[PDB]
Write a protein that binds this ligand. Structure first.
Ligand SMILES: Nc1ncnc2c1ncn2[C@@H]1O[C@H](COP(=O)(O)OP(=O)(O)OP(=O)(O)O)[C@@H](O)[C@H]1O
Ligand SMILES: Nc1ncnc2c1ncn2[C@@H]1O[C@H](COP(=O)(O)OP(=O)(O)O)[C@@H](O)[C@H]1O
Ligand SMILES: Nc1ncnc2c1ncn2[C@@H]1O[C@H](COP(=O)(O)OP(=O)(O)O)[C@@H](O)[C@H]1O
Ligand SMILES: [Mg+2]
Ligand SMILES: [Mg+2]
Ligand SMILES: [Mg+2]
Lengths: 422, 422, 250
């Protein structure tokens, strides 16, 4: 259509007609209004039979390309979308109703896509380029974006976006999805109420954050919880909750406040619980402190595929913190601090389930001893292809945290659930 | 030679007529359009007897030396040659028909060759010199260039070009070469379509990558595929494929993006199948994770002579990377993740055979149990062939992956091929 | 010349030729001055001329006869501690030059690991020189070097890798009277636990000294009918020579 040619011609000229440094210092509406005059002037020269609505659409497209996120803006806005995949300048896919399908949109050039990705990542403050070719981030709106640079992606820089979900799941939803048997839900309720230190371990996309949210839903409302995340993904209904959020290095690369700083400050604002949005770095150390140095009941979420692996990664993180503690000391601290290690994993069929509810019970010489209260045994593959399994207790009638249950009167509930779940 | 002598005489005058640095000052991508006239106009400026037929060849050679890649040009241009290899200004070998062969072509001097290689690599943007004698790059043409500088290669500058084979063997070709019997071909087809996890073991140059490509040929077009190759070798026809390639560490030991660093990201961009060009280290772990963390149907390739060798080697690779997982856990992960292992070997006769198609069923005593389905049996040795060509199905009705085959509706072909294998 | 100096019996020479042609991952071992470099050069003289061989030598010593050899030499940290192209980097690059055999001049440290990978990952027929007094001591040194590489490799993993990659070890020693002899031709046979089991196809046995003080000894075979690498010989049709040599040794 003549509209596309007119837009291309106007763009090829307005670049040298409007100074970028002037619009760069204005909000989206201000920049669009300023560029409206430039678009009108361009239309005046070599004018075409374009309607006012066509001019407005062209101005919106110019704003999206120069300042927005290019041909994605029409799609990103749409709510029907679940995921957006690009994997090349000339191809873009969308997930609708659980089915991926091609789209009619595309970028002018893979360099346009590259700079669009750079803009999107910069919105979080990270950098993607030939020296830093891979960038994963979670946007403030909550959607996740992963981009990879040409030096690795032979087909040009590749981009993927997964849009933030409006509604979170609750323990009832997990029970109905069979991610955890109802007795497992009861035991989780006991563990959450009884202020047992929690490390929800899992793998990528394995539902860790959802478990953390559902568990924190069990906290006594009176307690002063201090959420601490890299992004605003936790929603707590408790009345007294303080939500923090780290800030990464920006521009020159200063003003950053890492998770460790936030936790170390949390220690000095008398929080009943600390709920770390995710543990990746030395903060684990400062988190493990205040799991036992008061603030009992703090929770964290961690990326590991097995409770043994989770403990190993905690030890590795603490060691990398530079505190130079002996490995024996680190193991002792872990044993003394961590009480429960829930593990959420995704199975072959794609469903997500809580494979282990492990409980750290002691340190034997060199190895931490872990006794599992709930374990998920996979029977096999159903007729329909969906993996099928059953949760079962280990028969423990008095887990380590039993004492804490006695503190809150939940001893009977725990005893009932433990034996009834087998 | 008369032609070479005349060309050298003409070039001696041309270099003065058009300064050597003059072309560099001009746009090298289009400066040749000028020098071509200089040689064309008043051809034989030295008044050297020649003919138009030979004059055209002389002018083309002069242009190639001045602008092109000199004597290397036909080699690159010709399609018959897969690999070019230069050990110095004197000796240059090519690869054709699967065999190496010396060639009559040679360069005038080491400085000429060094300039040629510097130009060829710089076209990608990298630089090779005494400061950085080593150099590795991938050209836009789909080729890999490795260059070593004289300060290291005592014989002189060393160069190796590995071109991307345009035509990969189709499955019909493999059937024709008796590599796999038609029943084996159908079993492979069902396995590929049935979204079974593959590990294509093979011997040195036993055709692993070609087998992997012909296997990918079976993927449903709608499924997202994220190809992660050490070196671009695969060629997929699916509409929705994504190609990734690692980067070796710079000579300073920086900028490296190892395989695991790629597959870990592959986990995060919603793939349907992850395909690893060659699993050769701790990256295997991550792949196996993605093998069972959903994404079922991923296919990686490994170097080994027997399926048992391949699986033991995979355990070894997993235990690297400092992950420190128990061997029992590694075996459990492997049995739960991998489904089918295919072993292909190059026989003494010079041909290649898909020697094994086997299935993993479990440990049954901490020793992974491999149940072969298709075996290549050598009834004996031909006096001059030493090859028989017998592919036999072990029977074994209802292989472990039978249920998935039924789910996808390929049960008919699986039964028809596994049975009536001969 | 080596046969003339009785350093190896003709049967030993034939077995060595079999190993060289049969693409067995060799590791020449021997004390300093044992001529191990000379032995390595002679062994390379047996490689098939078509095969492409890349020579990564810390200092130029080898002189191959084949027509398709690429010679490489390391660099010291000339640039004030920088610019050091260590042997390990050279081998890592050689892995990307599609060579048939990688002939390391001498293995002194981390470069061993990658070399082993070369043997395990396609480049069969690779060779190398190691400074050692006994084949077992040589294997221990190789494991130690791999560990020194800094890779977080459990000792069991390194032992298994050595088992699966190496195929032959040749021991060359300078004897008391200043002569050179080849003492052992062993073949790593597997990891049967926490220790690497080893076979010995060819051995040298001393008996005493002559009237002039010269040590007296002779070579013999262990009678192993089929060495581990026997299958490789089948690949290149070297069964007959291997059997004949291992049988005629005694
Ligand atoms: N048990 C479950 N059943 C069904 N859907 C689930 C279940 N658990 C999680 N989900 C869905 O899967 C996604 C879970 O993502 P979640 O935020 O938990 O990931 P994460 O572990 O925080 O991720 P990452 O490790 O990549 O940062 C959401 O879409 C959630 O709706
Ligand atoms: N089954 C086969 N029969 C005949 N030739 C084959 C077969 N498989 C591979 N080849 C040839 O061997 C060459 C190497 O194959 P490829 O798999 O790319 O390397 P590698 O064997 O090292 O993985 C290819 O160019 C191909 O033509
Ligand atoms: N079998 C042998 N008999 C006699 N002299 C030998 C023998 N092997 C090596 N030499 C002599 O030893 C010298 C150095 O040996 P060399 O290969 O440098 O050992 P290394 O590599 O351990 O230093 C050579 O110059 C050679 O003349
Ligand atoms: Mg999360
Ligand atoms: Mg290959
Ligand atoms: Mg020496």
């Amino acid at each position: 259509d003549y509209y596309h040619a007119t837009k291309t011609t106007i763009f090829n000229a307005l670049l040298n007609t409007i100074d970028l440094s002037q619009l760069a210092q204005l909000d989206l509406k201000q920049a669009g209004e300023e560029i409206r005059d430039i678009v009108a002037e361009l239309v005046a020269i070599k004018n075409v039979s374009m309607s006012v609505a066509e001019q407005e659409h062209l101005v919106q497209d110019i704003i999206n390309d120069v300042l927005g996120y290019g041909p994605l803006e029409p799609l990103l806005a749409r709510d029907d979308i679940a995921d957006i995949m690009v994997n090349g300048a000339h191809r873009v896919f969308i997930e609708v109703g659980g089915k991926v399908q091609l789209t009619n949109v595309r970028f002018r050039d893979n360099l346009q896509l590259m700079n669009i990705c750079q803009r999107i990542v910069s919105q979080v403050g990270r950098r993607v380029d030939e020296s830093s070719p891979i960038c994963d981030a979670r946007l403030p709106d909550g959607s996740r974006v992963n981009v990879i640079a040409p030096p690795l992606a032979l087909d040009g820089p590749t981009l993927t976006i997964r849009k933030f979900k409006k509604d979170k799941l609750t323990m009832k939803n997990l029970v109905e999805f069979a991610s955890i048997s109802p007795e497992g839900a009861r035991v989780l309720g006991v563990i959450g109420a009884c202020r047992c230190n929690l490390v929800i371990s899992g793998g990528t996309g394995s539902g860790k954050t959802t478990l953390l949210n559902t568990m924190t839903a069990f906290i006594d409302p009176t307690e002063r919880v201090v959420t601490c995340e890299d992004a605003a993904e936790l929603q707590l209904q408790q009345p007294h909750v303080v939500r923090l959020e780290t800030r990464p290095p920006n521009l020159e690369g200063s003003g950053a406040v890492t998770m460790r700083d936030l936790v170390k400050n949390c220690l000095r604002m008398r929080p009943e619980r600390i709920i770390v949005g995710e543990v990746r770095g030395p903060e684990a150390f400062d988190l493990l402190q205040a799991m036992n140095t008061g603030h009992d009941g703090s929770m964290g979420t961690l990326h590991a595929n097995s409770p043994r692996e989770a403990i190993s990664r905690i030890e590795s993180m603490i060691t990398m913190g530079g505190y130079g503690l002996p490995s024996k000391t680190i193991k002792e601290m872990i044993v003394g601090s961590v009480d429960v290690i829930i593990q959420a994993a995704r199975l072959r069929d794609g469903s997500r389930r809580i494979t282990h509810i492990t409980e750290v019970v002691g340190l034997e010489g060199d190895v931490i001893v872990t006794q599992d209260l709930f374990v998920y045994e996979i029977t096999g593959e159903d007729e329909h292809g969906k993996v099928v399994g059953k949760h079962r207790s280990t028969g423990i009638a008095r887990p380590r945290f039993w004492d804490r249950a006695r503190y809150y009167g939940l001893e009977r509930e725990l005893a009932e659930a433990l034996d009834a779940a087998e």
